[PDB]
Design a protein around this ligand. Structure first.
Ligand code: NA
Ligand code: NA
Ligand code: NA
Ligand code: NA
Ligand code: ZN
Ligand code: ZN
Ligand code: ZN
Ligand code: ZN
Ligand code: ZN
Ligand code: ZN
Ligand code: ZN
Ligand code: ZN
Lengths: 328, 328, 328, 328
């Protein structure tokens, strides 16, 4: 099923408690959503499906190019599909900068607030505010008001302090975050801190995350080994095993996956076109071969390949076999 | 917007009155739905989007393979998208044989009956019962009870008498159809008659349709030039202009398109893979090129190409520039 | 075997007498020479293999780029191969303009004159002087001295009056040609006249050739139906059957083929690369498949395909089954 | 130029004296010969071009399939080309087993004996007798009579003791070889011994070669560090640097290269077909693009790429910059 707000909070709390994380898979379409959920289900895992600003725009079609429309359309599709699987699937929106808040996150929050007001659950279970391009104080002022709106709609907020590529987060940056937002008692939030992490597969310092947890623990009057933050790891695709393991130990509960699942989705499509070149093209006066230019023929292979890569992510992040539905 | 039942009936009545038809485009995904609606909008035309049994199964994903789930999921997606376009888009389900009625058309009718009972509109605006593999009397017995259910849910039924490939419909076959179902007063229906028409692009007798109209007119006590039937043309892709024109004159209001839009969708994907071969594949120890293995890069080209082919269909069937919303 | 000068003259005389022609296939390599000779042999036909200036340069390799070297190297190769076939193969050089005479045709003539002086046969059996870019009088002055040199080396000269693309040859142009060169008694020559013919496959006037024959016959005091000229048809690839037939009737004895055999050679290579994409490329960390990146694997397919196209040319030009060796 | 027998012997003697080796490149065509010689010339190196039984058969064309014909045809071509380069190029025939001696090596030896009898040089400068499938005594009996014939025709014989894949050569095997053939005083020979070496790129014991040299030195009454054998390294493509270096130290003077140059030749052809897919194929009723289906367009890229790989071989084997013509 779609993760209820209660289930999603429990997912993240269990991940943190047990030092594992969920892959958050960027999707752009019915096929990619289907591949992701099938991957989670094959791994006996709960998981997160996220739509970026560009993914949402693509989802809305070339005739619309509207982020809210695309996100809502894909979310409505995902609600129907996820009801047929025995794992929990949470819906999330990815990086939204300041000048897109009024055209992405805010209208989506408003839609969910309306659902909640009528006794329903929110359409998305988390939204990202990406304030890494603005000064920390401005970032956290926006985060504070968004956290209030988000919590009131039963939604978890993801925020980012410092910049993802494609200087590190200071102890004071971590300190300000705890001071402005608390440690979950004013609403759950996820924190993307910057520790040398980059988008795309081509100098990670996971110790920055360990430092953030210690700085927060000291601020809160907690034991030295406490982990007050739930961290998000941006630029997950292409990471070393030892680096992932360290990140998990320091409280990463969500790792974003996009590049690696894109390659997995495209790879069998390329193979299909090449081996069926004279079927997918009308060559030498012939009319091609409908059975191989039927989009389903190669898109089913793309779906299966992407699902395999998602299963790998679940095993790498150690959430495989741990779905809170306990289908074994 | 999505066509209301009232708008859809008006679409078909206007098409018939003015000797034009709508393309009914088989879709299987968010991308293909988006391409189809953009095509209708670019042509200033209303249109129909249809899901086959196989398309619905594909839409539900490899982990589900459930026709109802896929149709509902894609219909919910389409409802969100179509609200953003200034043309009317009707949703239809394609060929459902006897042994799939209980797992496709009937549950979908039930969903729409529930919506209507609550003061809403049906999820789909038409459903096809394909009884061409059973004897005419059995076909029409099923059609009669389905027409009653369909009309009660504000849904148009499509039926088929005789077999589409990939012998012709007799005057008595046409006669039995009028006798069992009437001429619309017991609920609107669309009729696929068989006149030498075949699925897939590789002996049409459109005069069979003219004969059916005359046989029905005589039965009903109408003038010789009356056209009591609203016909559906199966195997639209790859047809001659002169054959389409004749079909339109005899009351074809809906022409099914699948093969031709499949080729249009796939063609730029193939081109993409070939010209970006060393970007979509990791070759010679290199890591490929994310900007070209990102599915959006080639799927946007696929969408645009499919939309162009849909525009061509609207111009071929003469529904281009005739949307009942009159945006000019 | 390689055509002796005596056999070559007999080939052309028989072609003219019986209204057929030989394909003259542009070759650039051991593979293309092999494909051409196999094509002639499969068709039971004699044939011509020709090297262009660019083909000769390519034959000499990127480290040499010398037309004489490439032509000699490929001619020496062809001499060895043709000795193993029961058809006659003549070697020819294609379009040589004025500023390349001193670096192609003249040195090659000199090589053959040396062979003949020692009691041997010439290396090539014909050479083309292409003077179509210079005024007719200058063209024919050069042709006259080259014809003397060529005849002394037992070599047939091909000349061109008027320009091949990618205005027509006048009666006076034809008249001047007979006046300057005679009708074979001062050495055999072949004549490329311009009648709307073009290089490459994308307004032919074969009657220009009929007119030339009549003009020459009148000059020579011959009957009206005499054909004093042996014509060459440039731009043979992609020609209509009716146009070829007419050309043959008017004394075309040689039709140049390049574009069509190039496509035939390349087509299975392309097919090979696509269907073996993951064998001819090292993909995803794999090491490819030696059996399909071995050049012989696809070059044998290229050879066979080119040979098939040459067989087609022999049947189109009606020289198939007419080899002067009479192997039946 | 082509290596004279005197120059070839000097090449191998200098290689041995200075612990370097020549690549021996398998060629099958005018293009591959041209690529190889250009590679040697670009590296300022002398080199060897070899034709296998299969390469020779391919060289003769599908209509002939005769090893002698193909080898002679390609050798005659190579003689013309090599005269235009300022490095020495030796011609060699590769693996000939017992049942092919009468149809490859022996007739070729006979051709060269005829040339030598008339005061000329042999057509090939070395021939391989591959007796690795027969018992050592039989191997060496054949080798002894072939060495006599070869030396009389000014030709170096290559022999093989033990089997190349795709057990090691014993001290007695090495001993028998010296006893039967001497150490060059009865004619120069090259020795392929088996030390865990395999054809094709996917447990080398170079110390077997060191052992052979010591065993031979002891037999001959020479100092312990003497290297009486000139070794040949079969399966050169895909070898480690450290393994090549060791082999050179123990007297390898010739390293066979085939797989690696095949990949280099094919790789840009594949790239060409993919990026020009709609030019090399007639697609969607179009007629393709002659400039890219012209075989020269991609074969020039193949030639250049293969030449680059040959340059790499010359640098790996340390013969680069050491041509005995001393063009610097
Ligand atoms: Na990354
Ligand atoms: Na059709
Ligand atoms: Na042409
Ligand atoms: Na090897
Ligand atoms: Zn990110
Ligand atoms: Zn459990
Ligand atoms: Zn149909
Ligand atoms: Zn209007
Ligand atoms: Zn020409
Ligand atoms: Zn005969
Ligand atoms: Zn070998
Ligand atoms: Zn030097």
């Amino acid at each position: 099923p779609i993760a209820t707000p209660e289930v999603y909070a429990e997912m993240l709390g269990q991940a943190k408690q047990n030092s594992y994380a969920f892959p958050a898979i960027n999707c752009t379409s019915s096929e990619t959503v289907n591949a992701a959920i099938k991957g989670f289900a094959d791994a006996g895992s709960d998981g997160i499906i996220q739509f970026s600003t560009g993914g949402a725009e693509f989802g809305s079609g070339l005739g619309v190019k509207d982020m809210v429309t695309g996100a809502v359309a894909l979310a409505e599709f995902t609600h129907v599909i996820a009801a047929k699987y025995p794992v929990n699937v949470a819906l999330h929106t990815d990086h939204c900068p300041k000048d897109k808040l009024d055209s992405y996150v805010r209208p989506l929050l408003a839609i969910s607030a309306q659902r909640v007001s009528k006794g329903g659950n929110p359409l998305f279970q988390s939204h990202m505010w990406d304030g890494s391009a603005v000064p920390i104080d401005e970032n956290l002022a926006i985060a504070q008001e968004l956290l209030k709106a988000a919590a009131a709609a039963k939604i978890i907020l993801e925020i980012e302090i410092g910049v993802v590529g494609g200087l590190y987060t200071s102890p004071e940056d971590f300190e300000k975050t705890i001071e402005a937002l608390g440690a979950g008692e004013h609403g759950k939030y996820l924190l993307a801190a910057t520790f040398g992490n980059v988008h795309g597969v081509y100098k990670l310092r996971p110790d920055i995350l360990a430092q953030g947890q210690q700085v927060a623990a000291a601020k809160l009057g907690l034991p030295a080994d406490a982990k007050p933050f739930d961290f998000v790891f941006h630029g997950g695709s292409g990471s070393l095993k030892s680096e992932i393991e360290e990140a998990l130990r320091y409280g990463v509960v969500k790792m974003n996956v996009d590049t690696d699942t894109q390659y997995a989705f495209t790879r069998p499509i390329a193979g299909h076109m090449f081996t069926n070149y004279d079927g997918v093209l009308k060559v030498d006066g012939e009319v091609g071969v409908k059975k191989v230019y039927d989009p389903r023929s190669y898109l089913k292979k793309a779906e299966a390949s992407m699902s395999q890569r998602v299963v790998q992510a679940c095993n790498d992040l150690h959430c495989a076999g741990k779905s809170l539905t306990h289908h074994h």
